[PDB]
Amino acid sequence: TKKIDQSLSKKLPKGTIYDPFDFSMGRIHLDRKYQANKNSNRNDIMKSGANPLEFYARPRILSRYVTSTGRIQHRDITGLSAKNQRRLSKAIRRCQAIGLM
Amino acid sequence: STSLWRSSTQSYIYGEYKGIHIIDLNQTLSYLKRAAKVVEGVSESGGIILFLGTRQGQKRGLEEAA
Amino acid sequence: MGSLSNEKFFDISLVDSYLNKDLKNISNKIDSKLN
Amino acid sequence: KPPVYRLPPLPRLKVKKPIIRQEANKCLVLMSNLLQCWSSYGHMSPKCAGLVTELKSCTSESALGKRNNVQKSNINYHAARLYDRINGKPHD
Amino acid sequence: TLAELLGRSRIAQVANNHKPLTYTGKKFHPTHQIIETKPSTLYRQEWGLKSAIPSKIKSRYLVYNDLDTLERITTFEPRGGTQWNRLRFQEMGVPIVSNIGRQNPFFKYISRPEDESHAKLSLFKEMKGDTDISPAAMKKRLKKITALIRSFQDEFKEWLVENHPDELKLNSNKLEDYVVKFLNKKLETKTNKKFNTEIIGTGGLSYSLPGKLKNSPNGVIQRTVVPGRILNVVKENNDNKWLAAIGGFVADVVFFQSPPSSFNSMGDFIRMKTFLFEILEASMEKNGSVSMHARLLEPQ
Amino acid sequence: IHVVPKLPNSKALLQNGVPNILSSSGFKTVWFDYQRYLCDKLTLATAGQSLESYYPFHILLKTAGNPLQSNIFNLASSIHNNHLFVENILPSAVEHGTNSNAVVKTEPSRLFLSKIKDSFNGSDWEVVKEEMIYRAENEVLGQGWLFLVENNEKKLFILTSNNNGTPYYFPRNQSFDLNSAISIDEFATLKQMKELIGKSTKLNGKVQDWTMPIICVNLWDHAYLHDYGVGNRSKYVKNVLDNLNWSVVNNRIFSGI
Amino acid sequence: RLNRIMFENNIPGDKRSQRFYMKPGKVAELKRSQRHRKEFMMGFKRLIEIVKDAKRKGY
Amino acid sequence: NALLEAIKSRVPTIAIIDTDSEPSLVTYPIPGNDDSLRSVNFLLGVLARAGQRGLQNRLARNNE
Amino acid sequence: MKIQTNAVNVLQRTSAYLKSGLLKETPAWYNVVASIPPSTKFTREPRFKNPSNGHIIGKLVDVTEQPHANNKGLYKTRPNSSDKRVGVKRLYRPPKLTYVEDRLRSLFYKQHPWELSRPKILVENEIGDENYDWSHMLQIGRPLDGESVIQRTMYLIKTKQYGDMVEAYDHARYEFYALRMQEETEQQVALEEAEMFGSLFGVSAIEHGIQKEQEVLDVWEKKVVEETELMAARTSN
RNA sequence: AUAAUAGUAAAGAUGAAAUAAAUAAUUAUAAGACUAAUAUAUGUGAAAAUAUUAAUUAAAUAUUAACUGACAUUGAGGGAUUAAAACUAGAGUAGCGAAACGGAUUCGAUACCCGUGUAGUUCUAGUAGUAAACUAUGAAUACAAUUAUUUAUAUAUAUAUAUAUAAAUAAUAAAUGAAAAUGAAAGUAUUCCACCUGAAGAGUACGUUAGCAAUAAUGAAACUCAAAACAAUAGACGG
Numbered sequence A: 001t002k003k004i005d006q007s008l009s010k011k012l013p014k015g016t017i018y019d020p021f022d023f024s025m026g027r028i029h030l031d032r033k034y035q036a037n038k039n040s041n042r043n044d045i046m047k048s049g050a051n052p053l054e055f056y057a058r059p060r061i062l063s064r065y066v067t068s069t070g071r072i073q074h075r076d077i078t079g080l081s082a083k084n085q086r087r088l089s090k091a092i093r094r095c096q097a098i099g100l101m
Numbered sequence B: 001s002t003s004l005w006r007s008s009t010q011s012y013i014y015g016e017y018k019g020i021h022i023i024d025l026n027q028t029l030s031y032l033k034r035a036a037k038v039v040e041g042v043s044e045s046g047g048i049i050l051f052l053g054t055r056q057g058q059k060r061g062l063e064e065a066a
Numbered sequence C: 001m002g003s004l005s006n007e008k009f010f011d012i013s014l015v016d017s018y019l020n021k022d023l024k025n026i027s028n029k030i031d032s033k034l035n
Numbered sequence D: 001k002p003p004v005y006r007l008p009p010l011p012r013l014k015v016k017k018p019i020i021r022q023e024a025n026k027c028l029v030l031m032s033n034l035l036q037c038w039s040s041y042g043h044m045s046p047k048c049a050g051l052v053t054e055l056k057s058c059t060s061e062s063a064l065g066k067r068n069n070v071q072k073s074n075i076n077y078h079a080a081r082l083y084d085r086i087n088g089k090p091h092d
Numbered sequence E: 001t002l003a004e005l006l007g008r009s010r011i012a013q014v015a016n017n018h019k020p021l022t023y024t025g026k027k028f029h030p031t032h033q034i035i036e037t038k039p040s041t042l043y044r045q046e047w048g049l050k051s052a053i054p055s056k057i058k059s060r061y062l063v064y065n066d067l068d069t070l071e072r073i074t075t076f077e078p079r080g081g082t083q084w085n086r087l088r089f090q091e092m093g094v095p096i097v098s099n100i101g102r103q104n105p106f107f108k109y110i111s112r113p114e115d116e117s118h119a120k121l122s123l124f125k126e127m128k129g130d131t132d133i134s135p136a137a138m139k140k141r142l143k144k145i146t147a148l149i150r151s152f153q154d155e156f157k158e159w160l161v162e163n164h165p166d167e168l169k170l171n172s173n174k175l176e177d178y179v180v181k182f183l184n185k186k187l188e189t190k191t192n193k194k195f196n197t198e199i200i201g202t203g204g205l206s207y208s209l210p211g212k213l214k215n216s217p218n219g220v221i222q223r224t225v226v227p228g229r230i231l232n233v234v235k236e237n238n239d240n241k242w243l244a245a246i247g248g249f250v251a252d253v254v255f256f257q258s259p260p261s262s263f264n265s266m267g268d269f270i271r272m273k274t275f276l277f278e279i280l281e282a283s284m285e286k287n288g289s290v291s292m293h294a295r296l297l298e299p300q
Numbered sequence F: 001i002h003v004v005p006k007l008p009n010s011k012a013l014l015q016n017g018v019p020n021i022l023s024s025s026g027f028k029t030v031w032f033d034y035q036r037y038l039c040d041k042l043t044l045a046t047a048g049q050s051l052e053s054y055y056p057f058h059i060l061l062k063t064a065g066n067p068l069q070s071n072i073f074n075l076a077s078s079i080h081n082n083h084l085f086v087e088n089i090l091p092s093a094v095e096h097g098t099n100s101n102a103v104v105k106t107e108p109s110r111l112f113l114s115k116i117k118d119s120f121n122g123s124d125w126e127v128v129k130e131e132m133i134y135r136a137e138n139e140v141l142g143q144g145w146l147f148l149v150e151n152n153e154k155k156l157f158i159l160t161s162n163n164n165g166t167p168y169y170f171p172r173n174q175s176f177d178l179n180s181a182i183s184i185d186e187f188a189t190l191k192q193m194k195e196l197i198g199k200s201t202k203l204n205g206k207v208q209d210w211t212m213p214i215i216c217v218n219l220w221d222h223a224y225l226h227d228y229g230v231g232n233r234s235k236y237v238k239n240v241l242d243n244l245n246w247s248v249v250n251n252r253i254f255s256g257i
Numbered sequence G: 001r002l003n004r005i006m007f008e009n010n011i012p013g014d015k016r017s018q019r020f021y022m023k024p025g026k027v028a029e030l031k032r033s034q035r036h037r038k039e040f041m042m043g044f045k046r047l048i049e050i051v052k053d054a055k056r057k058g059y
Numbered sequence H: 001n002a003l004l005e006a007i008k009s010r011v012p013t014i015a016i017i018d019t020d021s022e023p024s025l026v027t028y029p030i031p032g033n034d035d036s037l038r039s040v041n042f043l044l045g046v047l048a049r050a051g052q053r054g055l056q057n058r059l060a061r062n063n064e
Numbered sequence I: 001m002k003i004q005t006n007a008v009n010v011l012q013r014t015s016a017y018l019k020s021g022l023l024k025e026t027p028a029w030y031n032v033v034a035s036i037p038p039s040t041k042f043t044r045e046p047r048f049k050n051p052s053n054g055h056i057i058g059k060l061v062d063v064t065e066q067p068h069a070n071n072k073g074l075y076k077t078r079p080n081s082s083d084k085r086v087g088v089k090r091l092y093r094p095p096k097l098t099y100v101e102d103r104l105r106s107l108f109y110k111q112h113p114w115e116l117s118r119p120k121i122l123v124e125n126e127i128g129d130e131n132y133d134w135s136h137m138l139q140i141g142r143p144l145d146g147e148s149v150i151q152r153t154m155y156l157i158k159t160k161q162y163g164d165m166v167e168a169y170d171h172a173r174y175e176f177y178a179l180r181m182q183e184e185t186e187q188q189v190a191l192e193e194a195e196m197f198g199s200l201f202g203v204s205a206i207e208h209g210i211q212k213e214q215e216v217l218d219v220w221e222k223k224v225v226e227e228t229e230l231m232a233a234r235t236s237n
Numbered sequence J: 001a002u003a004a005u006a007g008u009a010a011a012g013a014u015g016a017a018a019u020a021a022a023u024a025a026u027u028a029u030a031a032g033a034c035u036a037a038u039a040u041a042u043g044u045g046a047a048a049a050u051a052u053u054a055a056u057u058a059a060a061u062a063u064u065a066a067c068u069g070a071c072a073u074u075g076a077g078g079g080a081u082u083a084a085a086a087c088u089a090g091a092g093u094a095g096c097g098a099a100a101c102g103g104a105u106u107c108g109a110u111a112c113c114c115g116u117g118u119a120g121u122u123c124u125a126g127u128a129g130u131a132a133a134c135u136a137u138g139a140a141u142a143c144a145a146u147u148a149u150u151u152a153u154a155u156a157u158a159u160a161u162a163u164a165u166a167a168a169u170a171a172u173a174a175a176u177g178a179a180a181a182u183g184a185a186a187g188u189a190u191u192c193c194a195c196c197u198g199a200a201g202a203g204u205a206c207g208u209u210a211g212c213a214a215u216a217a218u219g220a221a222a223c224u225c226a227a228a229a230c231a232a233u234a235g236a237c238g239g
């Protein structure tokens, strides 16, 4: 067979430097273990400094912090500060009461 | 590390740098000279001097000192 | 710029210079210089 | 910012049932493929000849192959050895 | 004094670094200072750090973050492999060239205001170059600056009526120009980001000047041939070039006309074989990466 | 820091040079100036690295196989070679500064003259010296070194190096000048050497060579120009080989006692 | 895939927890203990990671 | 253990005292890094030579 | 832990044994310890100056010393809340040592990331032997590296040749580039010259990397094949 | 719950059972109570309490500036508020559910389990002032060695971290302690209030006060005994 699963091969980006270890399975496993959604902050409005309570009439943004059934995600999952989690949950509950979410 | 500080050593500390406490070598020198004179005195008096160190690699230094 | 600003939405500098005879004592000063 | 959770002092640091990777038996997988090969191309089909030959060699002497079927975890040995050093406990 | 000595100590010379020792993102340049110990000191676990490095370590190169920690260990990784990437680049003898034809950053050139005609582009870059700034510390750039700029109102309320009174009585299209120049002229004396942290040129990867020819016993070398590896068996998606792994760098390989048949044959194991490449050019991007372009020299 | 070694009877060397070979000015150039020049450059190249704690001979061996450390290798090889040359041409290795000894009559030992006959098909020492002078003039167009070496087979033979070529490690002898044309026989020697270096299994691609120098003559312009001049290097090599210190050269031959 | 949605929205757990009434004090006790065990496990895994890292470096 | 036995046995003690170590447990503390073999062997060497000089002075007074 | 008493008073406890007669013979250490008394104060000591930057510790600026208005335009007429809190703790906390050179060091390696790849030896030789004249960048005994730039910059600002630190730093940086370019050429040329005289090398750096990558890529080939066969069997289920 | 719809013959319950044109499905209507995730009761509140949304009113933070000039602390008596249950009126009553009546279990089963399910649980206006109303720890002030983690304010910049000062929480030194342990107090001190003086009898009796009432507050003595209690230790035992 001339095919390998993507999970068993690492694609080295262009312009990056590499070591021989980057072709091993240890690199594959190490990349899975340390795979965190750290790029969310730059794409996370609520981790930017905006007040989540100003989005109570924008269900599309709020729908990014609820599960498929509408259950607000725990702070352990959203990664927000206590204040933003508190404000975001209020926004979602207000949005639900208005008839938008 | 400053996180592991035993504050009873406060008077020996020169400052903190790069997350560790820097020991005041001016005091180390004075204490070392005093300790050295004690070893010299006991040796000159014929006493038994025991050198105890159980960290890896210390044996060579310990054996030659004895 | 302050009083001598071109913004449509100016600040209180302009209103202060007016009541302080500055926007007028400078308009005459500039015009006198032009003379 | 990621919340660090610090444990209280503990009587021990131990994993109840340390996970171990049990590599799959080479003879069992050979048998699982041959059985599948017969399911599609048919029993005794000439397409599964190589599978039959390989299976016979794998199982010739031992039905599960000659393998080092022994693997144990050492996490509990190291955890008990290093706990006092790394727990960050205050001095006495 | 002891404080003076400490500031100049070899440990002080290493700049503070808390960057992850285990980083799984894109690596474009070294992030940690390589520490080396001599063989005699390695035999005694001596590295010039606070504590002895564990005897298990057989490498003579490491990178560290903290001399000591609350866990009573040193935070270090026993690797020094970014040095071999630099030395392999040196062996390829390809000077780094500017794709924009800019002045050489390592020479003290006499520059002029040719690019200074964008005073309003960069004077406001100080407040507009805030891509990743706090929502309130960036807002402190609005009141703190406003007061500083508002303190020069009297100076600009007299200079403008003494050097360009016509514009004040005709149009503000030129007044705005006199404003941008005024602040910069009154800011060049100031020190706003007087130290620039941007990478300077190659960043230290190569100090080789373009122009020199490589003499060899078989004549002057006209094309540099370097062994490499093809990573993918299908060109980069959306790009007309494949990727190769040459000397610790990932390059874009351009083929003469066709792709060798070993590609289809090998498939996803193409990286298992070594091919010969020719390094066309090497460029440096602002992210601090090296843009190496190669050519799959095939036996013919 | 690599420092210039102190030489025996240095006050005499700074006043009357080396009798019959170099003058006072000629010796100041070759040793007091060039050796200082080499050691300073070596220190600048090696300071802050592991090589700083190694003697020049060990540095050249450690770096002999590393292409990008050739600059360090050249400096280490030159430093070692120069003190090999200055040592066997020196009036007396012992420091007769307070003994005011003026009678140093050193002559080839029996073991040296026995190995010369064995290795040169019965040729005498005088004839071998003529071959050495000839080899230097025809094989070293520019800078280099002339050596009489002994190999693992107890045979003395003549080796010439271009620029800073070590006698110890044949891959870096630099005995063939590839700037000019080479015969098929010379290309065969180079091709055979390349094959030997490829048979080594070590990750450093290094081979075993047990050749050792016995006599060293500096063929650089720093040693002869001032006293002999361009074109008179064969008169310089003749004087060196006729006024060698044989207490040092005899001690370099392994006896086994 | 449908089963994964049920478990990530705690549908089976919520349904079972709604079969019988629990006093508010008991509910509060169970919520406190569950959180402690969740946090305790996170602290345990952090210490095991340090152990593994320390072991790898020869400590 | 050794330090407490020394106290119980009235045996004077010298020790290298790092920033996390208790100074009062020893008669003559030496403030210093105890984790590096170089630092330890440097301080041990000084103490060892001091002992040697005492021994040499005792053997000398016996001769004369 | 409690301040121990019995380790430093061995002489006094021993003296009671000898005076009473419980111990017949004087120990060999007894006279030595008597002549060299142990230090037994174990006190916390205040400090009134940061040794690194000379900042004074324990000084309160009184309102009489702030006669002019502040940045807000207000005069200070009464002590503020911070001035009224006792600050004894600052006298005893080990001072944080700071250095201007540390700021430049971080800058240099941010501007030149690949200088980090040049190995540095932290093991000291003898700090007391360093006789450096920083009128020039090169020094006998130490490598050319980022620290050479920092020390050169400090000498310029110390001699007052330059006033702004940035200008002195830029001046030192160019001196560093010149020395780095002369060394990059000496190495390239030395290699070229050696090959022209018949120098042979077993393995180059590029070749060394290829061999190491092959060793890893061979183990990776086996595992991939194995894990692409367990998947086939497990998926067949 | 009711009605419609097609569609049927079982459904429901339990350890297993049995008691009382359906169940299930799709629509439509009505009613009462409750408030999933977020969530940590984090935080807030004097305590009791407090987490679906919005609004109105009231109160609540930090720093700075100015001002008052000891105006403070504590607090007998007193006052106010005070879970659940309970009671007096008028509404409400889906679900839950003392009691009662039945079904089971059992040798028996005034129980645990099941059914039917009244008071009650809900709202409005009141009475009453009790809980393991608990941190089983009254309030205030001065002070004492560390670390970690959050939070807040401030400062700086080579702009995102760094440096400061407080608060909270966690683990500790010292100290205290019968110990378990406490840890900024259960430490070092000062000030004020409440309360205790062997067990049992007893928070009972009697009286008194208060309340529609249940009760609440106050609160003894005799007789009898040499007991009685706490922390910790080693065992034994554990469905």
Ligand SMILES: [K+]
Pocket: J041
């Ligand atoms: K709370």
Ligand SMILES: [K+]
Pocket: none
């Ligand atoms: K008064």
Ligand SMILES: [K+]
Pocket: none
């Ligand atoms: K009062």
Ligand SMILES: [K+]
Pocket: none
């Ligand atoms: K009261």
Ligand SMILES: [K+]
Pocket: J093
């Ligand atoms: K009801």
Ligand SMILES: [K+]
Pocket: J134
């Ligand atoms: K409680």
Ligand SMILES: [K+]
Pocket: J138, J139, J193, J194
């Ligand atoms: K009270």
Ligand SMILES: [Mg+2]
Pocket: H018, H019, H033, H034, H035
């Ligand atoms: Mg230590």
Ligand SMILES: [Mg+2]
Pocket: none
């Ligand atoms: Mg139904």
Ligand SMILES: [Mg+2]
Pocket: none
């Ligand atoms: Mg809820």
Ligand SMILES: [Mg+2]
Pocket: none
């Ligand atoms: Mg709380």
Ligand SMILES: [Mg+2]
Pocket: J075
């Ligand atoms: Mg009160």
Ligand SMILES: [Mg+2]
Pocket: none
């Ligand atoms: Mg009623």
Ligand SMILES: [Mg+2]
Pocket: none
């Ligand atoms: Mg019932």
Ligand SMILES: [Mg+2]
Pocket: none
């Ligand atoms: Mg009431």
Ligand SMILES: [Mg+2]
Pocket: none
């Ligand atoms: Mg009651």
